[PDB]
Amino acid sequence: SLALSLTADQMVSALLDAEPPILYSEYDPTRPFSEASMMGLLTNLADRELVHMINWAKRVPGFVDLTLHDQVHLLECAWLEILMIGLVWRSMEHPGKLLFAPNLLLDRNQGKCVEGMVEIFDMLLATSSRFRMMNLQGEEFVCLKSIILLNSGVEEKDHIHRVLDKITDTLIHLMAKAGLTLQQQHQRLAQLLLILSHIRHMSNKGMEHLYSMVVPLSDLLLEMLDAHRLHAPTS
């Protein structure tokens, strides 16, 4: 009961300071590269990213106010979504390419030799393209990302509900500060959330590919995957 008091401004600030860093891959620019383990670099990247996400979520206003199991459930359901929205966020300035890391930029043709990549790839571009044309702002980005954390969890989680309203009021505040009319604020709010559904879609596609099968998934990355096992998929 401290997130429910934060003003919109000091809500964005808390989220902005909670922002995990952008990591680099183990890729070597000096030697030739092989798409025989892009998935190895991505796995190593995602794994190292997860740790930073876990602590970021703990710095999301209201998240700690939950029990572990709830915190665990939300993280298990939303980890790939949150990774995919951050990836898409930093890929806006590079159309037709995915910026997994400042040293790991990926074009559509790498989408080959590795199964499932192409489909997910084109989905990530479209989301990035949509965000790019929608001119997504950094203040809005951290808001949407925190919502995914708190909403992907499919005595009342009304606490989460009051926090979701909080983040919503925050977004409206940003758009109003940007100079959007009340209609534009509604429409834009709607559009941003509509794109979250695509992020849900892409994550689900990524999942069923990931736990289909090197690939040397980590201990932790196995947990976040098995949570999407028997709680959903299909033996």
């Binding site: 876990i54 602590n55 572990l68 915190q71 665990v72 201990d219 932790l220 976040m224």
Partner: peptide, 10 residues
């Protein structure tokens, strides 16, 4: 179960 619990307690 375990790993995520341990990483949530720093």
């Amino acid at each position: 179960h375990k790993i995520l619990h341990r990483l949530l307690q720093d």
